[PDB]
Amino acid sequence: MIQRTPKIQVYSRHPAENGKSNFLNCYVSGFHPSDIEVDLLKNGERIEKVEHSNLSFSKDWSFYLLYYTEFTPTEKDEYACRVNHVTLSQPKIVKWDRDM
């Protein structure tokens, strides 16, 4: 058996075709087993509507999740990714760096 803790990256992107759109992304990478729980948070509150969730694997024991949705950040709001996985004794919360 093998288990690996996910790497977690949280960042924003504007699609070049629609630049006034902004997306909040959580890239959760290289984890095993594939069982996982991943939420986007806004001011501590779970975001129910996340239109994109994109799972793949490389080696049979390495999984990759892109989790993202459109959003309209203000300098007031705090956003984060919250991840649960068997390798994590507590939920891991990664805050969005507003400049990323």
Author numbering: 0 to 99
Paper passage:
Beta-2 microglobulin (β2m) is a 99-residue protein, physiologically acting as the light chain of the major histocompatibility complex (MHC) class I. β2m displays a classic immunoglobulin fold, and is well conserved among vertebrates. β2m tertiary structure consists of a seven-stranded beta-sandwich; according to standard nomenclature, β-strands are named from A to G, and loops are named after the neighbouring β-strands. The characterization of β2m structure and folding dynamics gained considerable resonance when the protein was found to be responsible for Dialysis Related Amyloidosis (DRA). The mutant protein is the etiological agent of a previously unknown systemic amyloidosis, whereby patients carrying the D76N mutation accumulate large mutant β2m amyloid deposits, especially in internal organs.
In detail, residue D53 lies in the middle of β2m D-strand, one of the edge strands of the four-stranded β-sheet (strands ABED). D53 is involved in the interaction with the MHC class I heavy chain; however, in the isolated β2m, it is totally solvent exposed and devoid of interactions with neighbouring residues. The D53-to-N substitution does not alter the regularity of the D-strand, as both D53 and N53 share the same region of the Ramachandran plot (Phi/Psi angles of residues 53 are -109°/113°, and -129°/98° for wt β2m and the D53N variant, respectively). D53 is the only wt β2m aggregation-protective element (namely an inward-pointing charge) at that edge of the four-stranded β-sheet, according to the analysis by Richardson and Richardson. However, even if the D-to-N mutation leaves a regular β-strand, unprotected and potentially prone to aggregation, the D53N mutant does not show any increased aggregation propensity. The D53N, D59N and D98N 3D-structures superimpose well with both wt β2m and the D76N mutant (RMSD values in the 0.10–0.17 and 0.63–0.73 Å range, respectively); most of the backbone structural differences, relative to wt β2m, are located in the protein region comprising loops AB, EF, CC’D and the C-terminal tail. The D53N, D59N and D98N variants, which match very closely the wt 3D structure, show a similar Bz-score pattern, with positive peaks corresponding to AB-, CC’D-, DE-, EF-loops, and the C-terminus. The crystal structures of D53N, D59N (this study) and of D76N variants match closely that of wt β2m. Their overall 3D-structures are maintained without rearrangement of the loops or of the secondary structures; even locally, the mutations are quite well accepted, with minimal rearrangements of neighbouring side chains.
